[PDB]
Amino acid sequence: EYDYLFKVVLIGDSGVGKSNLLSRFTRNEFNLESKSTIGVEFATRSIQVDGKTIKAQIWDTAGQERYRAITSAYYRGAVGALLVYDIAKHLTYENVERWLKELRDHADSNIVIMLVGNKSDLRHLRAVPTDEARAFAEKNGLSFIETSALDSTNVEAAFQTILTEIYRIVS
Amino acid sequence: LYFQGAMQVTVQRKEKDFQGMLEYHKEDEALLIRNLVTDLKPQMLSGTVPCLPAYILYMCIRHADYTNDDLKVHSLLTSTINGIKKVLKKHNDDFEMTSFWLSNTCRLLHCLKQYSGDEGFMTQNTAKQNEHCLKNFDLTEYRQVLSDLSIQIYQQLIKIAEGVLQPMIVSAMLENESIQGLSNSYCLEAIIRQMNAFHTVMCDQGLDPEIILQVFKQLFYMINAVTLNNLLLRKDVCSWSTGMQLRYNISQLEEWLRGRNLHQSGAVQTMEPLIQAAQLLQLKKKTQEDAEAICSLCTSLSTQQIVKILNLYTPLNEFEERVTVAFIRTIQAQLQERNDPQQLLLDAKHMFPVLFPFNPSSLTMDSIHIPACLNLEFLNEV
Ligand SMILES: Nc1nc2c(ncn2[C@@H]2O[C@H](COP(=O)(O)OP(=O)(O)O)[C@@H](O)[C@H]2O)c(=O)[nH]1
Numbered sequence A: 001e002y003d004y005l006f007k008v009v010l011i012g013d014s015g016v017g018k019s020n021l022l023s024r025f026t027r028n029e030f031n032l033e034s035k036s037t038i039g040v041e042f043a044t045r046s047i048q049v050d051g052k053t054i055k056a057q058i059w060d061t062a063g064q065e066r067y068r069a070i071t072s073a074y075y076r077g078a079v080g081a082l083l084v085y086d087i088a089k090h091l092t093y094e095n096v097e098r099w100l101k102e103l104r105d106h107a108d109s110n111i112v113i114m115l116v117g118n119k120s121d122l123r124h125l126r127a128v129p130t131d132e133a134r135a136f137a138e139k140n141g142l143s144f145i146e147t148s149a150l151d152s153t154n155v156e157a158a159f160q161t162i163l164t165e166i167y168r169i170v171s
Numbered sequence B: 001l002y003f004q005g006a007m008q009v010t011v012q013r014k015e016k017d018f019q020g021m022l023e024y025h026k027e028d029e030a031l032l033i034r035n036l037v038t039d040l041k042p043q044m045l046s047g048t049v050p051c052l053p054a055y056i057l058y059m060c061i062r063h064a065d066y067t068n069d070d071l072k073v074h075s076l077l078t079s080t081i082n083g084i085k086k087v088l089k090k091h092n093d094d095f096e097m098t099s100f101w102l103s104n105t106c107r108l109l110h111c112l113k114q115y116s117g118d119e120g121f122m123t124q125n126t127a128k129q130n131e132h133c134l135k136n137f138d139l140t141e142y143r144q145v146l147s148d149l150s151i152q153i154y155q156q157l158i159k160i161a162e163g164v165l166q167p168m169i170v171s172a173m174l175e176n177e178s179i180q181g182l183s184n185s186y187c188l189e190a191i192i193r194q195m196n197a198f199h200t201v202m203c204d205q206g207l208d209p210e211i212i213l214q215v216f217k218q219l220f221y222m223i224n225a226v227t228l229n230n231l232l233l234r235k236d237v238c239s240w241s242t243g244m245q246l247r248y249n250i251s252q253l254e255e256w257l258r259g260r261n262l263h264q265s266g267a268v269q270t271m272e273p274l275i276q277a278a279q280l281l282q283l284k285k286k287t288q289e290d291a292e293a294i295c296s297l298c299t300s301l302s303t304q305q306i307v308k309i310l311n312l313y314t315p316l317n318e319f320e321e322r323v324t325v326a327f328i329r330t331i332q333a334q335l336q337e338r339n340d341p342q343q344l345l346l347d348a349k350h351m352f353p354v355l356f357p358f359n360p361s362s363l364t365m366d367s368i369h370i371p372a373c374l375n376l377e378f379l380n381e382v
């Protein structure tokens, strides 16, 4: 059982690694041949914070328009969001603005939002400099981290950080 | 000149260590079948190695083989098989008892193979084990009878488990909103608790893990069909909201599987129709592109099923619309190359054929001893 249940949505373009951030976080698995998410999918994991049990209920969503749910109204009740782009594809980062605008059209105003630059293992292919994405996060009131679902770098830290920040706001 | 036999000369028996055999007197056989099969309750055997009843039976058979007593062999087995059947007709609704005798029947079968004498069943024996093999008798025909029995028993185990789960499925899977932002009753936790109980029973009794994996593959198949079939009848649950709820429910079942190391059972795969139905409910349903996305994605739903769900689809906010006739016809035209079944509903009672593994063990017959609680003191070690 648990003391808090935190609904957290994963949003951002198709291919950026949302489902693998989720599989890495919830069962330490990564798959190179990930199937595209259809509609909304789910996984959960419980962690400790301030000595209390926090169940993270993670809503993993489709980034491909032809795979998306008819409506974004399901964002309601979300206390956290990860807005994910691929550091090796500047377009996925350009699209963060639009993901972000939609989120704030449907989400509660206290939602905690973390901008996540995924695939940091692809250093040789980087298209989004860290400083650029960080200034965007700052200016938009987003927290910010770079992760790699592949080599696991900062995945634990991204989720632990957002869940801890949510705990501080709601407790 | 004569000799009556006289110190009256008598045939004395050689004094040797435990061979791991078990002899009994023909007159005492009903007491044996009675205390070892008929009146034996699974729970008396807590705190011993699983399937001790099967080992004990093979040890008795072994001795019978050794005295060359084929009347004993036939008697014992024929009588044991009938005992077990009788216990199962009486306990036809008892999951624990049924699984108990499945497990033991299978181990007795493994013993008869492992110690058959056929070198093909023996590749994994230690020398000590090889010398516990049957010497005189080839019991192939009985092995066949035991294999037939275990299938009958497995079917009764599935029947029992499905009977318990049935009244729970629709309510848990379709009639219980348990996550936020989407807007006799059972919840999904109660199905999961019931499956834990089944799993624990099967584990505690040392059922072959391949059989356990198959049991849950089979029960998940049932949840798939029962849930999908109810959804194929009802407008009130065909909305995007149910789609998401259902997907969440399915993911909890999947995580349960992983937690019990059951994820490779094939169970997940049997849910693909229900998963696709859940996705279908969530997807856009207006344009040509939308219809192509649906036809590409719904490979485990028949055309009739996809059409039924689109026909049933009922928005929950007036701000959304019912699927149009033209949209359905577009689906129908796109799905023409298909060869789907004539019947709309899935057969919820479909049984996957069970494959029973052969799992020889490292137990040595000459280290096995009967616990007093079985009241088999009238058995004697040889
Ligand atoms: N190199 C690298 N590849 C990744 C990483 N995360 C995901 N991928 C790959 O990116 C592809 C799309 O990943 P997926 O998680 O399905 O993307 P999603 O549509 O955002 O859910 C898959 O081939 C992956 O295995 C990462 O951190 N580094």
Ligand code: BEF
Pocket: A012, A013, A014, A015, A016, A018, A019, A035, A036, A037, A038, A061, A062, A063, A064
């Ligand atoms: F799951 Be992804 F967004 F294709």
Ligand SMILES: [Mg+2]
Pocket: A018, A019, A020, A035, A036, A037, A060, A061, A062
């Ligand atoms: Mg995904």
